[PDB]
Amino acid sequence: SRSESTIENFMGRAACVFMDQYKINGSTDRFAVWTINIREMAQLRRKCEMFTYMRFDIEMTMVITSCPVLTHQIMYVPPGGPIPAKVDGYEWQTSTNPSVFWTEGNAPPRISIPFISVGNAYSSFYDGWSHGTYGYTTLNAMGKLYIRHVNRSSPHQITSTIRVYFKPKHIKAWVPRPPRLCPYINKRDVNFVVTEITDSRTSIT
Amino acid sequence: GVPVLNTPGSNQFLTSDDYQSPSAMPQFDETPEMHIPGEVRNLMEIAEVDSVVPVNNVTGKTKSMDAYQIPVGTTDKTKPIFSFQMDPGYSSVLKRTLLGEMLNYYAHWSGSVKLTFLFCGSAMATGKLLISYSPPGASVPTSRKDAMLGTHIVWDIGLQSSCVLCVPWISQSAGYITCWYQTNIVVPPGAPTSCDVLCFASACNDFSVRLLRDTPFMA
Amino acid sequence: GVPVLNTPGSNQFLTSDDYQSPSAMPQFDETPEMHIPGEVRNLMEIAEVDSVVPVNNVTGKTKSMDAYQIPVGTTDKTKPIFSFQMDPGYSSVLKRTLLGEMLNYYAHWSGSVKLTFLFCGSAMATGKLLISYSPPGASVPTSRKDAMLGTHIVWDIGLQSSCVLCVPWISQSAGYITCWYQTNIVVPPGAPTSCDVLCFASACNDFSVRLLRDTPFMA
Amino acid sequence: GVPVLNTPGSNQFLTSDDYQSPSAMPQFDETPEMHIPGEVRNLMEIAEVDSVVPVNNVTGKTKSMDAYQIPVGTTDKTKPIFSFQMDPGYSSVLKRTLLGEMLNYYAHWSGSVKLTFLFCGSAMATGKLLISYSPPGASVPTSRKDAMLGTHIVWDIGLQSSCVLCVPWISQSAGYITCWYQTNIVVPPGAPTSCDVLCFASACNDFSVRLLRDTPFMA
């Protein structure tokens, strides 16, 4: 009767973790970056922060709109990959960086990322230093997701908005952890404001 | 080739689908799995762990350690010691525990809640406290006599320091659990009169949870 | 991959298709089925239940209980007691019963209709009524003598209080069922003269219904 | 035909896919395979081959044959002969070898590096050189005495002309390998005093490489 209380049923469901737009013609506003992390959405972050160590594969499904036939390149760089600094940068042509070519009107593109960490599990919490900077390790680095129009130009001005749906797959988790009481201040650190344990009451009876 | 018909539902992105997907890097050889202690296969393994219940969550002190401490010993016997609604969801006493925070992810849950009361007073102190549970339909007892004429347990504090009780029919007007001075805290000249009681709520080994939803805690 | 040809009929929404569909919430664990009395596996289980037939649906009284009551006992023997066309569909007497309302969902239906006549008079009353069934081709009888010279049953009311008859060839000018005073209602000084008769139409255990359509009752 | 649903990911060009493709010329009959010596089934077969390491890559001479030659014999014993960081990637001494250039295609690699030192002096010359390896955490030795109080090998040059050592924990502050005059190069009146030493770095038979990337050498 508790089948749905499993980690796969709990953690594994797609959520719209990244909203961004990118123009087709005109500098740095012509592509979208999104360094992949589990700390983007505050609702998904509270779930991944119940476990200290997690191990899962990633299946992403991009949802691209627009405002000719438009073709989009969604290039995924591995954690050691070269990052483009301009829409025309040579780094888009790298063979090592897998990319999908999706033209508008078809089913949305789907790309699947394995467990790419150097260690044995991703860390939700890191009590330690890089040297440095506290709470950051390069073991839970999952790459970036560079997205652009492959079209050279358009007579009209076209602005394309992309939604990324992040779904963990084959989730494995270790070391349970209490759910977070305080709200989130920043997306990189674990800093908090001292909050009350629970809503108050008039008396003890 | 083979004759094929595309049914309705082709070329759609159902967000909750479970299709096999083409991997970005098939060549990549994943790191072999390693044994890490604490494998979590179910979330009711989290809710089955006892956690301290902030019964004393009065308006003044819910940002200190005094929210957990039930003050006993200083002290009329007419008014109960404490009283709180039993349901974990939508009850400020059990709303934010290991048990309650897991149950706020699920629309429907049915099970039993186990309460454990720990007496944190001196070893020389002694007395009796009457813990009464009233069924969901029934009204809260007004006196110790009406609480005695029901489902209760007279807990001798000098004898044993922990009192465990498993409450049934906790699922979604719920049950009320109360405590009464049956006997004042009898103390020698050396030991301090005022004592504290801690509570521990956890799953009573069932807890089926069916319809997962979004937590009402994070905005 | 495999070579595939999309036949005509791909990417269309046939409203009456029966394809397997992708579930919105596969993870959801449905409530286990429970035994509820009255499992309905067929609609001819509904039409096989007898129901009272409003034979007396004259213009004045179709909004009262008097539409069902066949008045007997007050009273010439020249005119029949009642008479109605047999077909359930398109006949105001049997149009709105448990039998008739199921048969207005189906364009074609073939079976037999069982009629049951219940005498609701005093236990001391007695008499004879002649129930005559005329086949669809035949004309309605004009006298009791012409009704006697056909398919009929002389129903002794003092002996037995119920008379059952199964009418065949009811399918889609249909049969007519009539009733005649063979004998006036003989009554003692204590019992009241006027009596009532109830009718019950139901399926005679066949009723095959083939082409489902829309009911002509709801606008 | 058969009912078919197009999942998300249809009609996309994943660059790293491995689908079967329709051949342009199926009729074409390919030339039969022939035995050519040197079949290459793995790239760690390339990295397992020893290659000369440019230890003497000082600013003046990295465009000559003198970059490989370690000058020995002309000569204080206070300063070490040479010293270089052990990691093949991101270390100018081992950056561009058969071992290092293969490891710059891969983000992650873990294995052991085997170093071989060849003495290219006269057969009549003799002496002792102390090769000390310091673990990644440890600091570089400052004197020959501190290098002797660690992991080292006293290599008698007159006895044997090659000294092999396999360094562990080379994976991605790494280890340092150093050399010290334990003994000056003792030479007869006929043989020349100044001698040269060559180094050879190769795989120590493991070297697993996991995440292929682009080389940082070609622009």
mmCIF file of C-alpha atoms in Angstrom, chain A residues 1-2 4-10 13-14 42-43 46-47 50-51 53 55 59 61 63 76 78 98 107-108 110-121 165 167 169 172-176 178-184 194-205, chain B residues 11-13 15-19 21-25 28 30-34 36-44 46 54-59 62-64 68 70-71 80-84 92-93 95-98 101-102 105-106 208-212 214-215 217-219:
data_model
loop_
_atom_site.group_PDB
_atom_site.id
_atom_site.type_symbol
_atom_site.label_atom_id
_atom_site.label_comp_id
_atom_site.label_asym_id
_atom_site.label_seq_id
_atom_site.Cartn_x
_atom_site.Cartn_y
_atom_site.Cartn_z
ATOM 1 C CA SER A 1 0.000 0.000 0.000
ATOM 2 C CA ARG A 2 3.066 2.228 0.330
ATOM 3 C CA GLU A 4 4.194 5.271 -4.054
ATOM 4 C CA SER A 5 6.312 6.187 -1.005
ATOM 5 C CA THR A 6 9.421 4.803 -2.732
ATOM 6 C CA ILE A 7 12.274 7.075 -3.786
ATOM 7 C CA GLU A 8 11.646 6.517 -7.501
ATOM 8 C CA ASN A 9 7.973 7.447 -7.133
ATOM 9 C CA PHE A 10 8.853 10.379 -4.850
ATOM 10 C CA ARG A 13 8.966 13.157 -11.809
ATOM 11 C CA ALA A 14 9.633 15.929 -14.296
ATOM 12 C CA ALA A 42 12.866 25.485 -4.522
ATOM 13 C CA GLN A 43 10.292 22.673 -4.581
ATOM 14 C CA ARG A 46 13.601 20.506 -0.716
ATOM 15 C CA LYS A 47 13.214 16.913 -1.942
ATOM 16 C CA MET A 50 16.268 14.942 2.350
ATOM 17 C CA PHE A 51 19.180 12.694 1.340
ATOM 18 C CA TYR A 53 24.033 11.227 -1.194
ATOM 19 C CA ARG A 55 22.744 8.600 -7.491
ATOM 20 C CA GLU A 59 16.360 12.624 -18.661
ATOM 21 C CA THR A 61 12.859 17.235 -22.230
ATOM 22 C CA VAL A 63 9.966 22.680 -24.650
ATOM 23 C CA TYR A 76 25.207 19.686 -23.699
ATOM 24 C CA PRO A 78 30.212 17.509 -20.107
ATOM 25 C CA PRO A 98 26.602 15.920 -27.717
ATOM 26 C CA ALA A 107 7.677 16.082 -30.755
ATOM 27 C CA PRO A 108 9.882 17.922 -28.241
ATOM 28 C CA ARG A 110 14.666 14.513 -25.287
ATOM 29 C CA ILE A 111 18.245 13.973 -24.124
ATOM 30 C CA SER A 112 19.376 11.520 -21.439
ATOM 31 C CA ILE A 113 22.445 12.033 -19.248
ATOM 32 C CA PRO A 114 24.017 9.163 -17.255
ATOM 33 C CA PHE A 115 25.645 9.321 -13.824
ATOM 34 C CA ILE A 116 28.641 11.434 -14.837
ATOM 35 C CA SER A 117 30.167 12.144 -11.430
ATOM 36 C CA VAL A 118 33.733 11.201 -10.551
ATOM 37 C CA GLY A 119 32.703 9.894 -7.135
ATOM 38 C CA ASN A 120 30.104 7.260 -6.347
ATOM 39 C CA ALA A 121 27.170 9.607 -5.636
ATOM 40 C CA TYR A 165 11.969 19.434 -17.697
ATOM 41 C CA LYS A 167 13.416 14.049 -14.355
ATOM 42 C CA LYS A 169 15.934 8.270 -13.341
ATOM 43 C CA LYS A 172 19.336 5.737 -5.420
ATOM 44 C CA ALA A 173 19.648 7.671 -2.164
ATOM 45 C CA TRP A 174 21.576 7.295 1.081
ATOM 46 C CA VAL A 175 21.695 8.779 4.577
ATOM 47 C CA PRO A 176 18.248 10.279 5.286
ATOM 48 C CA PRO A 178 15.464 16.027 8.088
ATOM 49 C CA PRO A 179 13.416 18.245 5.768
ATOM 50 C CA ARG A 180 14.426 21.885 5.733
ATOM 51 C CA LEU A 181 12.548 24.176 8.115
ATOM 52 C CA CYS A 182 13.771 27.619 7.033
ATOM 53 C CA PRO A 183 13.247 29.196 3.589
ATOM 54 C CA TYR A 184 16.036 29.469 1.032
ATOM 55 C CA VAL A 194 16.337 31.597 12.187
ATOM 56 C CA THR A 195 12.689 30.527 11.890
ATOM 57 C CA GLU A 196 10.235 29.127 14.415
ATOM 58 C CA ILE A 197 9.810 25.364 14.755
ATOM 59 C CA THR A 198 6.045 25.461 14.226
ATOM 60 C CA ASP A 199 3.080 27.805 14.135
ATOM 61 C CA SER A 200 2.180 29.138 17.562
ATOM 62 C CA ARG A 201 -0.788 28.247 19.768
ATOM 63 C CA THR A 202 -2.751 30.166 22.383
ATOM 64 C CA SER A 203 -1.933 27.802 25.263
ATOM 65 C CA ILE A 204 -0.560 24.324 25.926
ATOM 66 C CA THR A 205 -4.149 23.067 26.249
ATOM 67 C CA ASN B 11 4.076 13.581 -30.689
ATOM 68 C CA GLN B 12 2.917 14.865 -27.301
ATOM 69 C CA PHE B 13 4.967 15.498 -24.176
ATOM 70 C CA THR B 15 5.175 15.171 -18.372
ATOM 71 C CA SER B 16 4.677 11.955 -16.356
ATOM 72 C CA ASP B 17 5.618 9.467 -19.085
ATOM 73 C CA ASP B 18 8.034 6.565 -18.604
ATOM 74 C CA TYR B 19 9.433 5.887 -22.071
ATOM 75 C CA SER B 21 15.063 7.677 -23.929
ATOM 76 C CA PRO B 22 18.112 7.937 -26.223
ATOM 77 C CA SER B 23 21.207 8.528 -24.106
ATOM 78 C CA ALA B 24 23.426 11.513 -24.885
ATOM 79 C CA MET B 25 26.683 9.616 -24.264
ATOM 80 C CA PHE B 28 30.430 6.875 -21.371
ATOM 81 C CA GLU B 30 29.621 5.030 -15.530
ATOM 82 C CA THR B 31 31.410 4.789 -12.203
ATOM 83 C CA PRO B 32 30.691 1.412 -10.559
ATOM 84 C CA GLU B 33 28.239 1.488 -7.684
ATOM 85 C CA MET B 34 29.800 1.458 -4.222
ATOM 86 C CA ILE B 36 27.369 3.623 1.101
ATOM 87 C CA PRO B 37 25.666 3.017 4.472
ATOM 88 C CA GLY B 38 22.093 4.217 4.759
ATOM 89 C CA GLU B 39 20.407 2.994 1.567
ATOM 90 C CA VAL B 40 16.957 4.576 1.327
ATOM 91 C CA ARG B 41 14.417 2.449 -0.520
ATOM 92 C CA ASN B 42 11.236 3.910 1.038
ATOM 93 C CA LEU B 43 10.166 7.164 2.673
ATOM 94 C CA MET B 44 8.168 5.405 5.396
ATOM 95 C CA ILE B 46 11.990 8.119 7.458
ATOM 96 C CA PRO B 54 6.872 20.616 20.105
ATOM 97 C CA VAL B 55 3.893 20.351 22.444
ATOM 98 C CA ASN B 56 4.727 23.593 24.297
ATOM 99 C CA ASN B 57 4.471 25.760 21.165
ATOM 100 C CA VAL B 58 2.886 28.715 22.967
ATOM 101 C CA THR B 59 3.118 32.164 21.396
ATOM 102 C CA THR B 62 8.564 28.664 19.460
ATOM 103 C CA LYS B 63 12.100 29.868 18.599
ATOM 104 C CA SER B 64 13.851 28.202 21.556
ATOM 105 C CA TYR B 68 9.607 20.882 23.221
ATOM 106 C CA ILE B 70 6.335 20.028 28.769
ATOM 107 C CA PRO B 71 6.550 21.742 32.195
ATOM 108 C CA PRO B 80 -4.806 19.318 32.262
ATOM 109 C CA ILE B 81 -1.063 19.387 31.690
ATOM 110 C CA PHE B 82 -1.270 19.406 27.891
ATOM 111 C CA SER B 83 -3.692 18.551 25.086
ATOM 112 C CA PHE B 84 -3.299 18.358 21.306
ATOM 113 C CA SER B 92 0.626 22.695 14.669
ATOM 114 C CA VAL B 93 1.958 20.268 17.296
ATOM 115 C CA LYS B 95 2.733 19.420 11.685
ATOM 116 C CA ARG B 96 6.532 19.698 11.448
ATOM 117 C CA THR B 97 8.114 16.450 12.613
ATOM 118 C CA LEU B 98 9.760 13.619 10.709
ATOM 119 C CA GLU B 101 6.538 16.603 7.105
ATOM 120 C CA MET B 102 6.453 13.348 5.136
ATOM 121 C CA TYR B 105 3.539 15.411 0.594
ATOM 122 C CA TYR B 106 0.558 13.049 0.294
ATOM 123 C CA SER B 208 0.233 3.819 3.718
ATOM 124 C CA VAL B 209 0.401 7.027 1.663
ATOM 125 C CA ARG B 210 -1.336 7.113 -1.700
ATOM 126 C CA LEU B 211 -1.630 10.435 -3.584
ATOM 127 C CA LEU B 212 1.579 12.487 -3.647
ATOM 128 C CA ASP B 214 3.145 19.423 -3.213
ATOM 129 C CA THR B 215 4.189 20.512 0.262
ATOM 130 C CA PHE B 217 5.510 24.692 3.500
ATOM 131 C CA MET B 218 7.803 26.052 0.765
ATOM 132 C CA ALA B 219 6.476 28.994 -1.243
#
